[PDB]
Design a protein around this nucleic acid. Structure first.
Ligand SMILES: Nc1ncnc2c1ncn2[C@@H]1O[C@H](COP(=O)(O)OP(=O)(O)O)[C@@H](O)[C@H]1O
Ligand SMILES: [Mg+2]
Ligand SMILES: [Zn+2]
Lengths: 97, 614, 154
RNA sequence: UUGUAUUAUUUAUAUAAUAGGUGUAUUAUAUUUAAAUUUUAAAUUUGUUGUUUUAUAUUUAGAUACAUAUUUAUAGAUUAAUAUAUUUAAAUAAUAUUUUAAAAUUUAUUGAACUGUAAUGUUACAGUUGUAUGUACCAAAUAAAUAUAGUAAGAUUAUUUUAGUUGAAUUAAUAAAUAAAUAUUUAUUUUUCUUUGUAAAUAUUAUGAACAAUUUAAUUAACUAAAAUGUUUGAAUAUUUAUUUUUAUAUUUUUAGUAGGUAAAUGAAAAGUAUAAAUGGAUAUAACUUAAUAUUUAAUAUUUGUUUAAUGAAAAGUAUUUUAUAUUGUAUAGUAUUAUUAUAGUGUAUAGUUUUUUAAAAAUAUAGUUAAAUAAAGUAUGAAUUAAUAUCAAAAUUUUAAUAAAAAUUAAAAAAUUAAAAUAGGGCAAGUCCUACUCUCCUUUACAAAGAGAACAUUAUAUGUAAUUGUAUGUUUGAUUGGGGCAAUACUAUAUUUAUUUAUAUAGCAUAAGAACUAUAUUCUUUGAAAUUAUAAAAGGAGCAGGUUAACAAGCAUGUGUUUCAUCGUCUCGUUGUAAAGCAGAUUU
């Protein structure tokens, strides 16, 4: 059904849209998409930070830890396991790289 | 007895947004009608159709003008007219053209102009592993063709372009190439480009141009979305702020525009211009003839193929002895000839080329030209009487089977499919291109954007979708060269062949077609409603104009010939005949009362005036 | 036999069989293929309606269609009410605007087909071409033709 | 019943003086100062209707997702696996899930008094079925059952409300920020003149357009009042060129007062939740599926008992034969009736063996040209279909979304009785024609699959296999289970070759023990040609759909001869139109 509303004057009777100052559905989608794109670009303004092992999502953290388990128990620098699930290479130099 | 009132007996299609809602994008085309374009995320925003009708009007460097003079290009195709302006304006662009309007030049020449501008005016330096332009193409043959078309431009303009494919030591060879020669353009598969990026053999620091030659396949799952991932990496690079501002632009050349391509481009590059001519989009050229040959059984297909080859002049070598048969099966038999010999059988040379290739003037809006010589990495070094042919099969096994069968029969054939080793594949393609073999048995490998001289295309297995069929058809019907496509079909492809035949007969686009009879028969409720409204209006017009009816019949005539009567629940028409069950309930109540009375009377008559007693 | 399958809805795109029909460049002489009616109508005919606000002694019938522009706002040249009741029921006739002449009848409405729009039209205003009643024309296209100046060229 | 066994629970429509006139009296509808307003509801219809269906009325019957978790009390993850476990919570609870209705099918059983055969009214044969039919719906009948009730439909009980968007979303299928819409619950005080509905969790989500054109541009409202909207002069008249006459104010929606929580959809009792016990409205509410009752049709149809010429069984009735007149028993059928109507076996011929109103007419049924009888109203009795409906819809005109007594304008429509089908009501998207597809049906060489059987192994009944056959039966036009791209020999380096830049190989790598969870960095452990046919095969009344403004047409005929289509020509000749605004068949209700 249509959401009826308590009126405060005949202007509300003549009114069709409850919020005239609000963009229509298509303009809302356009504005939301533009805002999300701008926020994403602002987030990505800096390079892709190479987060450590402990900061990876739950489905990569344990795999990386198991891959590098032996090196953790036997400590010697220069040991890196070339896992597959790690973060993808960005392609350009970054401040964190 | 069961029901005596129906509005629409058949059932409508579940599809809502389009005719082919259920089909995947990479199997069906997308309707380009404005009604669909309105909801489309790409075709609605920006579409460029105005044209500049001369390269002289186009701002081009003398180097580019000399390059196109060498290529023999003198008049711009409408696609080039529409696309050069926007690519020079440096906007992400989607060029569409019906398989042979010059998309390669359309998206290459402006990009080379921009690269020259960057190198000279802006003086952007050239680094070792940071190329200016990345060009993407699916097949190795297309990669080589693009490498040739880019090498001519590079030799003309001082730029450098490389290309790489699968080899023995792929990693070593590619790394050696990168170490040795710094490059401006790299034509390579997106998979290899991603390999290089992940192994940080190449960098996007100085990359400014991305070009895709087959956007449909590249952005579809048919190629693993490698191009999509590469483009997302490019977008990340553009977003990156600490490096010098590079407004990387993407060009997508696509003979088809599908749901996948349009959605990807619309949702990633919102400010993407589109260059399409809906009137000639998704249709074969006008200089292409079609012949759909039915076969009683799959066995007759080989005989039909032999008949077609003999008719077009690829006569076999008659075998009459065991040694001859053995050598025919074992060793290849290349053809030989020369231009002078063919003539007996450089304006004069160009005229001979026109006559041999069937070139005819290309009739555009208000100007005409003649198709330029093909752009392939293997020139036609050998000429033979027989007409060039290409036979597309269902798969690798069918391709090799047809190849061996023709060789045994006596024809000279080449084979092309992925499973062949690198050397054999190169040799086969080189043979066919140079003309030492006038018949090429292949699969869809060669159907994706190859500029090669083929007089006709045989489909040894009729395609089930418009995409592959139209690509194979366009392989032969170039700018203005005459082309012919035969298609050997069976009972299985009846629906698709009938649909394509009707569409080609009345010259309307193959926007949605399939091999499923239910899909091609059942309408979509709103479309059926529109057609029914038009039909009712036409019937009303005919009744008004021709017939005159009395007052006591006006009501019935208008009800049954001039009124639009909407269905009850189109989603359940297959169950309730498109009529309310309540009205159906009343109708069946009355009819059942009448039928019960009639049955009682009939029983009385048959038993002697009394049913129980008789 | 290899029996295929193709829906009529697919072929309906090419229903027009001429430039005039496909691209509506000229008057549609009972050969219009595609019609655009209102979203709620069921009888599928255009309506050129009038309004009455009093008896004939205060509002003449031709004044009913006074909300529409064109010749209808001018007093008709010929009135056929006082004398007799013509069989066709035409009660008013306007001055010939070229070879076209406009008539108004005292009936609920005659559902004719106009050769310019091509749509069935139900109204009392009918424009006839060079006195030939076989070619009727609705008031909308009559007014448009007069405005464009194509009175003698339709 | 050694507690009306106990405890709770439920419960009937037999029954009837009710009033002698508040509104009008030339026609529009409750509130009496006269006017104005007024002329169904629910579901269906997503092209939102004028489509579709239901409702006579009274009373009653009638449908289930737990709106809430107080001390004993203690709750991780994680790998394919081994294993690893640096490292923050919590109210352990389950049982449910509208309602009516599928052509149903399944199990078990009966029926040959009807009907259809064979036998000579009776006997025998019956639902993988006997001979069109098998006891007044033949996909029979009886008994049991709640099938994917879903991708049929309908119904669905609680007024006075207190917060966001009203046409978006749409990419199948390898390393890509994000579906949106609606609803429910919930979250964030970031600075700039003003203003601004962003986000999360959760539930659901086919209401469905074909062309052309253009485009990197175009049914809602608290009351009172207020209130701003709305027929001549580039001609005419005239004579042989001259005349004529070419702003306002005001009327219906830019406001207050008063009511009154707040910006609209999750019922209310302190009286069995009893200590309460003589004056508790505990008024706490389903317009259409149930049951009963009262009406309309209805002053109705129907009924109407003044005249008789003639069977002696039995199945069949059981209607109280007072004592009807060896043992046992005498009268009063069937079709739902005291009905169309003799049940006839035998058998006989003069028993008068005894219930059919009414004072006309229409209509209806019977009854000396050519190829006149019978059935009335009225007295009396008294059904049935039907029934949303206000005391009702004269008529015309005009119009609105399909008949539109729906709307508006205009106009003027008396009451009763009889007759008359003119309109509406009384099931109907149908008829013909052309195309297309499918079904039924036929056939066999392929597919599945029966059952049955032959043969085989082991020693007249079986077990184990079963390639034949049947083809009863079910199928037999969605091929992306494809194609492409990936090709050990990383790294640094060298050499040769090259279809005018490909191709190929190789030199370098052992070993090393004190600082204690550890630092984006590396392409090295080794795939280079699957020489199609799966998909059972095929032929020509009914069903669905389209078109009816057909289909075809750089043609036709056998290189040549020839315009297309049509206007009702002519005995080859030729006029006219046309190049589509042209040409098949149909054009009926
Ligand atoms: N203005 C032009 N004039 C003549 N030929 C052209 C022109 N533009 C491109 N071509 C030629 O026409 C052929 C097809 O060009 P191509 O770009 O490969 O087709 P596609 O657009 O499908 O990729 C090629 O031989 C090409 O050289
Ligand atoms: Mg191309
Ligand atoms: Zn018109």
């Amino acid at each position: 059904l249509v959401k009826r509303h308590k009126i405060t004057n005949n202007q509300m009777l003549l009114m069709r849209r409850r919020e005239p100052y609000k963009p229509t559905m298509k303009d809302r989608q356009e504005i939301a998409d533009r805002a999300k794109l701008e926020e994403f670009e602002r987030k990505n303004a800096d390079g892709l930070m190479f987060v450590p092992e402990k900061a990876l999502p739950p489905w990569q953290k344990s795999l990386a830890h198991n891959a590098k388990a032996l090196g953790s128990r036997i400590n010697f620098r220069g040991f890196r396991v070339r896992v597959a699930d790690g973060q993808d290479e960005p392609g350009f130099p970054t401040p964190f790289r | 007895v069961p029901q005596q009132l129906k509005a629409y007996g058949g059932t409508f299609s579940r599809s809502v947004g389009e005719r082919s809602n259920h089909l995947v994008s990479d199997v069906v085309l997308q309707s380009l009608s404005p009604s669909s374009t309105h909801n489309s995320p790409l075709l609605s925003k920006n579409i460029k159709t105005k044209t500049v009708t001369s390269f002289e009007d186009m701002p081009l460097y003398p180097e580019l003008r000399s390059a196109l003079r060498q290529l023999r290009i003198t008049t711009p195709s409408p696609i080039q007219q529409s696309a050069v302006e926007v690519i020079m304006q440096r906007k992400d662009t989607v060029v569409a053209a019906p398989h042979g309007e010059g998309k390669t030049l359309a998206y290459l020449l402006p990009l080379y102009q921009n690269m020259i501008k960057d190198r000279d005016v802006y003086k952007i330096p050239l680094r070792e592993r940071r190329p200016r332009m990345i060009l993407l193409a699916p097949t190795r043959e297309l990669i080589a063709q693009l490498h040739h078309v880019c090498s001519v431009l590079g030799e003309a303009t001082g730029l450098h372009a490389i290309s790489f494919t699968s080899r023995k030591r792929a990693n070593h060879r590619l790394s050696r190439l990168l170490k040795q020669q710094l490059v401006d353009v790299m034509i390579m598969d997106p998979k290899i480009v991603l390999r290089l990026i992940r192994a940080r053999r190449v960098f996007l620091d100085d990359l400014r141009y991305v070009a895709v030659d087959e956007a449909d396949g590249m952005l579809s799952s048919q190629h693993d979305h490698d191009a999509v991932h590469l483009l997302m990496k490019v977008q990340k690079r553009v977003m990156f702020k600490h490096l010098w501002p590079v407004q990387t632009q993407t060009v997508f050349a696509t003979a088809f525009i599908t749901r996948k391509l349009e959605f990807v481009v619309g949702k990633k590059y919102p400010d993407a211009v589109t260059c399409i001519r809906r009137q000639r989009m998704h249709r074969p050229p006008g200089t292409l003839r079609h012949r759909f040959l039915p076969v009683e059984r799959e066995r007759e297909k080989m005989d039909t193929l032999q008949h077609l080859l003999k008719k077009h002049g690829n006569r076999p070598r008659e075998i009459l002895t065991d040694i001859e048969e053995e050598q025919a099966y074992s060793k290849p038999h290349y053809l030989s000839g020369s231009l002078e010999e063919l003539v007996e059988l450089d304006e004069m040379k160009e005229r001979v080329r026109h006559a041999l290739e069937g070139v005819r003037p290309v009739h555009w809006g208000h100007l005409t030209t003649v198709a330029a010589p093909f752009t392939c990495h293997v020139p036609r070094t050998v000429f033979a009487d027989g007409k060039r042919c290409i036979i597309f099969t269902r798969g690798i096994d069918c391709a090799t089977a047809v190849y061996h069968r023709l060789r045994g029969c006596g024809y000279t054939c080449s084979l092309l499919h992925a499973a062949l080793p690198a050397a054999v594949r190169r040799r086969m393609f080189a043979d066919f291109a140079s003309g030492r073999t006038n018949i090429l048995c292949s699969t869809d490998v060669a159907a994706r954007g190859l500029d090669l001289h083929v007089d006709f295309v045989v489909n040894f297995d009729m395609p089930t979708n418009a995409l592959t069929y139209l690509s194979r058809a366009g392989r032969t019907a170039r700018q203005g060269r005459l082309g012919q496509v035969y298609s050997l079909y069976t009972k299985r492809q009846g629906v698709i062949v009938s649909a394509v035949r009707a569409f080609l007969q009345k010259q309307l686009p193959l926007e949605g077609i399939s091999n499923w009879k239910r899909h091609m028969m059942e309408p979509r409720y709103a479309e059926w409603r529109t057609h029914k409204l038009n039909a009712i209006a036409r019937s009303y017009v005919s009744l008004i104009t021709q017939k005159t009816i009395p007052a006591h019949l006006e009501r019935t005539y208008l009800r049954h010939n001039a009124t639009w009567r909407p269905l009850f629940h189109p989603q359940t028409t297959g169950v309730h005949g498109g009529v309310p069950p309540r009205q159906q309930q009343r109708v069946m109540d009355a009819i059942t009362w009448k039928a019960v009375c009639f049955r009682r009377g009939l029983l009385a008559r048959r038993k002697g005036g009394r049913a129980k007693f008789g | 036999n290899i029996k295929g399958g193709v829906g009529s809805f697919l072929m309906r795109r090419a229903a027009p069989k001429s430039i005039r029909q496909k691209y509506q460049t000229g008057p549609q002489f009972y050969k219009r293929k595609f019609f655009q009616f209102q979203k709620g109508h069921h009888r599928l005919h255009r309506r050129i309606s009038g309004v009455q606000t009093g008896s004939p002694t205060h509002q003449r019938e031709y004044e009913r269609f006074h909300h529409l522009p064109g010749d209808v706002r001018t007093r008709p040249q010929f009135d056929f009410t006082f004398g007799e009741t013509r069989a066709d029921r035409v009660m008013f006739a306007w001055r010939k605007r070229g070879d076209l002449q406009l008539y108004q009848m005292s009936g609920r409405g005659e559902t004719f087909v106009c050769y310019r729009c091509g749509y069935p039209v139900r109204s009392q205003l009918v424009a006839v071409k060079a006195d030939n009643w076989d070619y009727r024309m609705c008031y909308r296209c009559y007014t448009n033709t007069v405005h464009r100046g194509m009175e003698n060229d339709t």
